Scaffold this active site. Structure first.
Site, PDB file in Angstrom:
ATOM      1  N   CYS C 434     -35.829  -2.121  61.796  1.00  6.67           N
ATOM      2  CA  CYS C 434     -34.340  -2.156  61.868  1.00  6.67           C
ATOM      3  C   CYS C 434     -33.856  -3.431  62.570  1.00  6.67           C
ATOM      4  O   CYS C 434     -32.660  -3.697  62.513  1.00  6.67           O
ATOM      5  CB  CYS C 434     -33.818  -0.906  62.578  1.00  6.67           C
ATOM      6  N   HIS C 671     -25.661  -2.340  67.137  1.00  4.15           N
ATOM      7  CA  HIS C 671     -26.566  -1.689  66.163  1.00  4.15           C
ATOM      8  C   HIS C 671     -25.909  -0.402  65.702  1.00  4.15           C
ATOM      9  O   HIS C 671     -25.677  -0.302  64.495  1.00  4.15           O
ATOM     10  CB  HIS C 671     -27.937  -1.464  66.798  1.00  4.15           C
ATOM     11  N   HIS C 712     -26.970   2.529  57.664  1.00 10.27           N
ATOM     12  CA  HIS C 712     -28.058   1.741  58.253  1.00 10.27           C
ATOM     13  C   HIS C 712     -28.996   1.320  57.148  1.00 10.27           C
ATOM     14  O   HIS C 712     -29.690   2.154  56.605  1.00 10.27           O
ATOM     15  CB  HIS C 712     -28.768   2.611  59.277  1.00 10.27           C
TER      16      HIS C 712
END
Ligand SMILES: NC(=O)c1ccc[n+]([C@@H]2O[C@H](COP(=O)([O-])OP(=O)(O)OC[C@H]3O[C@@H](n4cnc5c(N)ncnc54)[C@H](OP(=O)(O)O)[C@@H]3O)[C@@H](O)[C@H]2O)c1
Ligand SMILES: *OP(=O)(O)OCC(C)(C)[C@@H](O)C(=O)NCCC(=O)NCCSC(=O)CC(C)=O
EC number: 2.3.1.86
Lengths: 163, 97, 871, 179, 212
Positions: C434, C671, C712
């Protein structure tokens, strides 16, 4: 057979006809919504709300515009999918009139097998079924298939298809 | 404002079961998955428009609207009374506007 | 009470009723009167005996109200209908009497807008305006070979491109350009030019019915279908090779109890059944045809498909209708590669266009082929190819023979080179899950500072497939969609960072790509500059036995020693550093004087025929070593003053370089996955950074949680965040988290973080922080500074030369973009390298070889006369 | 119509006033600087009331920082947001420990139905002429009317001054009930 | 149609002959490659010699429609189709062309539904004031090259059969013979509508023997 999406001109017709509780032939396109209702603004506003829900947008003067000129104004931005009003009315037709065990998907199956009508023209037959809603729930499966047959013939007559 | 809180809940005033359940939920402890409140005011302003319905045209929609706008207001006040009385709350009346 | 559900139909007569001295209330007035009953005095009165409050405004005293109502409505309808009928008749009388020529000079022409899609290059101010914002001392102080700038960016994700996504993220609705760009992307409209039903038409047409579509009519016709088929939504099986999470195919191993009826199968397939089963199958040749009879016996293993209902039904999918063909990629490439590769190729050509580079080989006019890097990477790579070779190959399906090479993470970067760039630069492919995209920027920076490259493609990409979706559900990282449905949430509101109720992340797919290069080269080339990459850092956390757990490693970037902070260090003060640079500039001058004198003394002993050569060589060597020494001093007092100083944080010094304080880091692109562990830990990390570096109380950083919209996308997450950061820097608009229903009460403890729910149009953002927290302890941070801070480091002439070159290139870029959009040829695969195979070695081994325009083919290539030349 | 709608799992709580206060302030700040809100708009006084009702030590420090760093020499607008800001900081310090108050300052509106020359019926909510505050509406209501019978402010001129007056509980000399 | 014609050997006729021997005598599969290879030479010849100059020429510089702004195009259309001497549009269908173009400029650059600033093309009888008026409402179009949808529209307007052929070459493609040779005879009687008023551009029919 040849798959066609339901025309706005048929959807609009059926929605008006069902709201006024009259047959499709009893509703002429030439007349305006305001003429047809007959000085009852409540029912006028109920039709306008149902068309506004179904087609998303409305013209600027839908009251004075004739039905053929609304059907042409909607077709410019109409896709072919039923929408949020037609889908709910068909579910209420099927639940309230078909015998316990017959669902929408069984109607769609019967039309795809017996007649061979695809999903686009099934939606059209179901709209003709809505316009000629029977009085009391159909007792058996055989008279429910006999009704779907009578609506297929009506749909085929109005659109101009041979079964 | 500071110290304010807004709980939004789906609710059909027409349903008796929703009325009973909503009041259980307001009065139930936080442990049991409610709010742990005790109402100081009830403002039951739900209503559907009935329009162009004369005496001869009174049917389902009217009998249903009457349930929303009277019968289930009485049932809501009933529920709040039964929840206050079960907890011995005799000194904090809920104002019904 | 006017304008309610119950009384809106009576509004028209309300003015009439007021003529009887009745009072009709606005909803505000009537609420005010009702709230007067809740005051303590009336409450105390209600507790004694019931209270009856007449708030009628005298309506009860209207005798025969329905008669008065019916009169007022009739009179108003009558007046309306009369004036409409008389007006129509008077207009038909005036038309017959004077004819149809009278209302032709009175009628006017209506102009409907066409969609004029812009590349939204950064706005360049006059040199007087940009010189004010930077400190006066910054001019000459920075080495621009060691300042990294983002010159271009792009994405492919659930909302289309970076242009469309930004519109949805910032405004929450599409403009005309937005709609047309989404309609084109999703293949709802194509461009037609030529005969259409005899009549010649030039414009958009519906793509199925080939009916003309005016640009004004696009929104009405397609907005609903574009929104219904974009962003976070129910998983569409057509997009994922028939994958339906409701009916997820597994296979149960059963032992056969009764011998199955023989089936007919080829001799090869029958021998393969015999090798597997042993004595639990009986294969017999059929003499008639030569096929074999395969009979499974009692006790043979068998595999029967069963379906499972999976509870993750929603994902951030690329808009339905997206097709690499629409962008110009050919069917031979599409067949060969893994669909993640297609998102990358589109993102790479779209980022070159945003850089104003239509022909990548243009870059080889300014840099050697060995100076164009690809520092971009993925989290898991080509998972469609992995599924091909682990699962589809097992089922003896038809799979290509080279499916292994399509699975590799480093293969997307290879296809970018093999089809577009044809560079021999560095190729460092990060794998950060990620955090990949922020780890990409950090590698791309270190590559350009080490001098191994002068341009990197950076960024990340990942795909969504069945297997990942499943295994993210088994780890309970992703939101359970059935639980969200139980809680009332629609798909759109399933990704809700920093919220009380946040319960796992929405999986997405796509790619994001930035082109970074040295500022000295961007100014030379005249490419647009969207931002300066001030700082980029990765960090592991600490000892522990949870790979998915986020941690506080990235806090190290604010590491600063506060034992002795009584007196301000000279080193932070830009005047001091500029004074020491000027002192050293004088010594470098004296070193060039003293080397030219020493060359004049040495040139005398060389004979007068060889003297010209020798003086040319040695003058060039002196010029080199003078530039080397000037740039090393600029680096030492402008760029790297804080590397050796334990009293200046890497984060403080990156900002200080361009004369920004810690208080000038306005926005933090979090994030913000919408997980419980991630969003607390991230707030707490930013809060502790800002607190340590003495950020002024009452100045929080404005959190930006872009993943409420996109979901995401793993690998790509930070690439998207960067693209959003650059769009904030150049616009001054800070998008809000439209899913932040209620910010988590725990996050109040962090005084230095603000969590807006709506778009703020600020007066400017000077810097943006981007943070990422990958699986496997990959923390990462990048600071990005508004590009107008760079222009204070150059002179008026160099600026104005730049501004003229960028204006020219923005116009050529608009040309190329619109031509490619309508003729489906934005992406143009290269057939040949810029050198023939005979020059390949010659170009690699000369570091001054550059391409030039070949007069015959009109195409940049290396010419044998510009290779190991003297000029 | 008697179908159940209610479930406990579908309840949405909203309690994060501490966050929204700061966002409300920042929105107002930038809406003034950009010129979307002017010194003659009741929207400035409404936002001032709503911010004061969420005053706490964090919100004051947030205002102090943003207002004290505003350059009053970039424009008229920046001078206006600095002046309004310093006044809203004073108000927010005064009502730090006071309970928050319902206080509508919207312009009261009456019905207006117009038919144009072409005969189209348009209903609007047009501002009343005598009644421009709620204090004036309470007076109008107290006097009643003929059918019922038996037998100084700075609003719409200086939003900054009306804001300055917000925390000061006006002493009612004689009540509307005497009239 | 390949029929021989006796014309005076002006510079424009000698260019016509050169193209008949080296460009128009080629098969269709080899025509477009030769036009792309000779492009720069061809345009230099058209601009110096022929009576239909290369349209995309902004102050001597040979551009293409793709690399011209909307102002550049409009001011070239007035320079080639509007006669300063008589202070009128040489043909009315040319004024329509230029109006249609100036309306497309508005359509492309406007943000909302508005009124055309060119209400009637009769307003173009002062073309410099009409242009300024349009490119002051939409000053973005002074600095943008033609959108590729507006290049295709412009070339589609150049092939309209119900108008006097445009007095210029707008593109080198498969139709370059039709652009170059169509409507080649009126010019010799109306040198006020030729580029330099130079007879040497034009085509004048005349017999070799009767010229004595
Ligand atoms: N035998 C001889 O010695 C001799 C000498 C000279 C000319 N000619 C003949 O004369 C004919 C025409 O002469 P040309 O050399 O000029 O050939 P051309 O270029 O093919 O003809 C002129 C064309 O211009 C168009 N045009 C011009 N003004 C127009 C307007 N206001 N509105 C609409 N269209 C307009 C017409 O198109 P549309 O027709 O499509 O409307 C017409 O076909 C030819 O057939 C040629 O053979 C013969
Ligand atoms: O179709 P239309 O002409 O636009 O509507 C006409 C009327 C107003 C007659 C129609 O909608 C209708 O029949 N409405 C019901 C009568 C009515 O307006 N009742 C009001 C219910 S609310 C109320 O009464 C509030 C109060 C003063 O206490």
């Amino acid at each position: 057979i040849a798959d066609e999406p339901v025309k706005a001109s048929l959807l609009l017709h059926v929605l008006v006809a069902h709201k006024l509780k009259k047959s499709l032939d009893s509703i002429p396109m030439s007349k305006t919504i305001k003429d047809l209702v007959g000085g009852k603004s409540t029912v006028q506003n109920e039709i306008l709300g149902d068309l506004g829900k179904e087609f998303g947008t409305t013209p600027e003067k839908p009251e004075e515009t004739p039905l053929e000129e609304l059907a042409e104004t909607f077709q410019d931005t109409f896709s072919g999918a039923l929408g949020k009003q037609s889908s709910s009315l068909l579910s209420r037709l099927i639940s309230s009139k078909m015998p316990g065990g017959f669902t929408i998907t069984v109607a769609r199956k019967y039309l795809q097998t017996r007649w061979g009508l695809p999903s686009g023209r099934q939606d059209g037959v179901l709209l003709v079924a809505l316009s000629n809603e029977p009085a009391a729930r159909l007792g058996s499966e055989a008279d429910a298939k006999a009704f779907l047959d009578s609506m297929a013939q009506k749909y085929a007559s109005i659109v101009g298809v041979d079964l | 404002a500071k110290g304010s809180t807004l709980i939004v809940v789906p609710f059909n005033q027409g349903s008796k079961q929703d009325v009973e359940a909503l009041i259980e939920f307001i009065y139930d402890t936080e442990k049991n998955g409610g709010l742990g409140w005790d109402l100081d005011a009830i403002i039951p302003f739900a209503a559907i428009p009935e329009q162009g319905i004369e005496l001869e045209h009174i049917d389902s929609k009217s009998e249903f609207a009457h349930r929303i706008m009277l019968t289930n207001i009485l049932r809501m006040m009933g529920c709040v009374k039964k929840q206050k009385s079960a907890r011995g709350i005799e000194t904090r009346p809920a104002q019904v506007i | 009470t006017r304008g309610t559900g119950l009384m809106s139909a009576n509004n028209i007569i309300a003015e009439g009723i007021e003529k009887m001295g009745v009072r009709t209330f606005s909803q505000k007035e009537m609420a005010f009167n009702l709230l007067g009953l809740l005051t303590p005095e009336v409450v105390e009165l209600c507790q004694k005996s019931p209270v009856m409050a007449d708030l009628n405004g005298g309506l009860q005293f209207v005798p025969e109200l329905k008669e008065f109502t019916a009169k007022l409505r009739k009179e108003l309808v009558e007046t309306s209908e009369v004036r409409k009928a008389v007006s129509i008749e008077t207009a038909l009388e005036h038309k017959v009497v004077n004819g149809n020529s009278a209302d032709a000079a009175y009628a006017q022409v209506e102009i409907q807008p066409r969609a004029n899609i812009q590349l939204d290059f950064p706005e360049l101010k006059p040199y007087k305006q940009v010189k004010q914002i930077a400190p006066a001392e910054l001019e000459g102080l920075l080495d621009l070979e060691r300042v990294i700038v983002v010159t271009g960016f792009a994405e492919v994700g659930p909302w289309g491109s970076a242009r469309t996504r930004w519109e949805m993220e910032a405004f929450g609705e599409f403009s005309l350009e937005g709609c047309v760009e989404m309609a084109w992307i999703m293949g709802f409209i194509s461009y037609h030019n030529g005969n259409l039903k005899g009549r010649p038409y030039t414009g958009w047409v519906d793509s199925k019915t080939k009916e003309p579509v005016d640009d004004k009519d696009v929104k009405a016709k397609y907005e609903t279908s574009i929104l219904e088929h974009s962003g976070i939504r129910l998983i569409e099986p057509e997009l994922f090779n028939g994958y339906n999470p409701e009916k997820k195919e597994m296979i149960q191993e059963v032992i056969v109890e009764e011998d199955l009826e023989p089936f007919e199968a080829s001799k090869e397939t029958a021998e393969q059944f015999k090798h597997q089963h042993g004595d639990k199958v009986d294969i017999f040749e059929i003499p008639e045809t030569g096929e074999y009879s395969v009979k499974l016996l009692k006790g043979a293993t068998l595999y029967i498909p069963k379906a499972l209902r999976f509870d993750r039904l929603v994902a951030g999918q690329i808009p339905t209708g997206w097709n690499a063909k629409t962008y110009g990629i050919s069917d031979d490439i599409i067949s060969q590669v893994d669909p993640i590769t297609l998102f990358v190729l589109v993102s790479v050509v779209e980022a070159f266009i945003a850089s104003g580079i239509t022909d990548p080989y243009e870059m080889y006019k300014y840099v050697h082929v060995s100076e164009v890097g690809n520092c971009s990477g993925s989290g898991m790579g080509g998972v469609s190819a992995l599924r091909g070779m682990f699962k589809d190959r097992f089922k003896d399906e038809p799979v290509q023979n080279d499916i292994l090479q399509e699975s590799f993470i480093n293969t997307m970067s290879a296809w970018v080179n093999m089809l577009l760039i044809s560079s021999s630069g560095p190729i460092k492919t990060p794998v950060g899950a990620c955090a990949t995209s922020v780890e990409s920027v950090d590698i791309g920076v270190e590559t350009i500072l080490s001098g191994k490259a002068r341009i990197c493609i950076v960024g990340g990409y990942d795909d969504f497939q069945e297997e990942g979706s499943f295994e993210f559900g088994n780890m309970k990282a992703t939101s359970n969609t059935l639980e969200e449905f139980e809680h009332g949430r629609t798909p759109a509101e399933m990704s809700r960072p920093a919220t009380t109720t946040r319960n796992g992340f929405m999986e997405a797919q796509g790619a994001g790509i930035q082109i970074i290069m040295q500022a000295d080269l961007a100014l030379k080339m005249g490419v647009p500059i969207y931002g300066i990459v001030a700082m980029a850092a990765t960090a592991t956390d600490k000892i522990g036995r949870s790979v998915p757990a986020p941690g506080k490693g990235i806090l190290t970037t604010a590491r600063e020693h506060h034992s002795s902070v009584k007196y301000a260090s000279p080193n932070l003060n830009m005047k001091y550093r500029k004074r020491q640079l000027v002192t050293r500039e004088a010594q470098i001058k004296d070193w060039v004087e003293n080397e030219l004198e020493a060359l004049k003394l040495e040139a005398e002993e060389i004979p007068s025929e060889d003297q010209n050569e020798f003086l040319l060589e040695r003058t060039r060597e002196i010029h080199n070593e003078a530039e080397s020494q000037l740039r090393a001093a600029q680096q030492q007092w402008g760029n790297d003053f804080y590397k050796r100083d334990p009293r200046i944080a890497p984060l403080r010094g990156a900002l200080a370089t361009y004369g920004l304080t810690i208080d000038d880091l306005g926005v933090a692109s979090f994030h913000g996955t919408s997980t419980k562990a991630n969003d607390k830990n991230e707030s707490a990390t930013i809060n502790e950074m800002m607190k340590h570096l003495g950020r002024s109380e009452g100045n929080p950083v404005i959190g930006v949680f872009q993943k409420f919209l996109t979901g995401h996308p793993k690998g790509a997450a930070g690439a998207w965040m960067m693209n959003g950061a650059l769009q904030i820097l150049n616009s001054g608009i800070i998008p809000g988290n439209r899913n932040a229903d209620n910010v988590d009460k725990i996050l109040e403890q962090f005084e230095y973080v603000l969590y807006p729910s709506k778009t703020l149009k600020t007066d400017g953002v000077r810097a943006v922080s981007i943070t990422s927290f990958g699986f496997g302890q990959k923390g990462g941070q990048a600071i990005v500074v508004h590009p107008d801070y760079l222009y204070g480091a150059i002179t008026e002439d160099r600026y104005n030369e730049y501004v003229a070159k960028v204006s020219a290139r923005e116009k050529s870029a608009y040309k190329f973009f619109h031509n490619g959009m309508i003729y489906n040829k934005l992406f143009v695969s290269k057939e040949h390298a810029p050198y023939t195979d005979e020059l390949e070695e010659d170009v690699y081994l000369d570091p001054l070889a550059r391409v030039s325009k070949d007069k015959k083919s009109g195409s940049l290539t290396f010419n044998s006369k510009n290779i190991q030349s003297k000029d | 119509g008697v179908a159940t709608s209610f479930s406990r799992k579908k309840a949405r709580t909203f309690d994060s006033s501490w966050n929204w206060a700061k966002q409300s302030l920042l929105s107002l700040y930038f809406e003034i600087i950009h010129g979307v809100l002017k010194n003659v708009d009741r929207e400035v006084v409404s936002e001032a009331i709503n911010i004061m009702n969420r005053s706490n030590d964090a919100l004051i420090k947030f205002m102090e920082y943003h207002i004290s760093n505003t350059d009053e020499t970039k424009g008229e607008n920046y001078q206006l947001v600095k002046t309004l800001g310093e006044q809203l900081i004073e108000n927010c310090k005064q009502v730090l420990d006071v309970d928050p108050v319902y206080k509508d300052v919207a312009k009261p509106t009456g019905p207006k139905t117009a038919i144009d020359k072409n005969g189209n019926i348009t209903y609007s909510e047009e501002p009343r002429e005598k009644v421009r505050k709620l204090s004036q509406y309470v007076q109008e209501m107290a006097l009643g009317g003929p059918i019922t019978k038996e037998s100084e402010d700075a609003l719409d001129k200086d939003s900054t001054k009306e804001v300055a007056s917000l925390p000061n509980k006006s002493t009612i000399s004689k009540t509307v009930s005497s009239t | 149609m390949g029929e021989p014609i006796h014309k005076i050997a002006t510079r424009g006729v000698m260019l016509w002959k050169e193209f008949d021997e080296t460009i128009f005598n080629l098969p269709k599969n080899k025509l477009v490659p030769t036009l792309e290879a000779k492009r720069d030479y061809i345009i230099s010849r058209l601009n110096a010699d022929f009576q239909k100059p290369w349209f995309a020429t902004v102050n001597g510089q040979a551009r293409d429609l793709a690399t011209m702004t909307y102002e550049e195009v409009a001011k070239r259309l007035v320079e080639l189709m509007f006669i300063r001497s008589t202070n009128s549009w040489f043909d009315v269908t040319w004024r329509t062309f230029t109006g249609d173009f100036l309306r497309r400029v508005e359509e492309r650059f406007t943000k909302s539904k508005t009124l055309s600033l060119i209400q009637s093309y009769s307003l173009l009888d002062k073309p410099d004031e009409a242009i300024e008026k349009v490119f002051n409402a939409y000053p973005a179009a002074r600095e943008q090259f033609l959108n590729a949808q507006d290049i295709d529209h412009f070339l589609s307007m150049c092939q309209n059969p119900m108008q006097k052929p445009v007095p210029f070459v707008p593109v080198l493609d498969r139709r370059f013979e039709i652009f170059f040779k169509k409507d080649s005879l009126w010019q010799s009687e109306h040198l006020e509508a030729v580029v330099d008023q130079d007879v040497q551009r034009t085509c004048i029919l005349h017999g070799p023997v009767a010229a004595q």
